[PDB]
Design a binder for this molecule. Sequence first.
Ligand SMILES: [Ca+2]
Ligand SMILES: [Ca+2]
Lengths: 19, 80
Amino acid sequence: RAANLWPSPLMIKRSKKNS
Amino acid sequence: ADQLTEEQIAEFKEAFSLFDKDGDGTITTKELGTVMRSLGQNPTEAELQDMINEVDADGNGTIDFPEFLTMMARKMKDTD
Ligand SMILES: [Ca+2]
Ligand SMILES: [Ca+2]
């Protein structure tokens, strides 16, 4: 679902925020 | 009270900073596919169309701040 496939990129964003 | 939080909300504003590069601060098919494109290959246009249609319930393919505030908060009880 988009509501999961949206959180996924956001999780990548979180990783970038950390990196 | 916890009036001045800015703990999790700081990460929401980050979306419109790291996800969008046009300066619109909205999530469209363009930003939705660009990340996947450099993450695990980009799907077809049809697949992308369905994906934004699966999120944008307003019927325009665009998510603003008010939408994002609810979208990234109303998580289901089941995890994929
Ligand atoms: Ca944009
Ligand atoms: Ca929308």
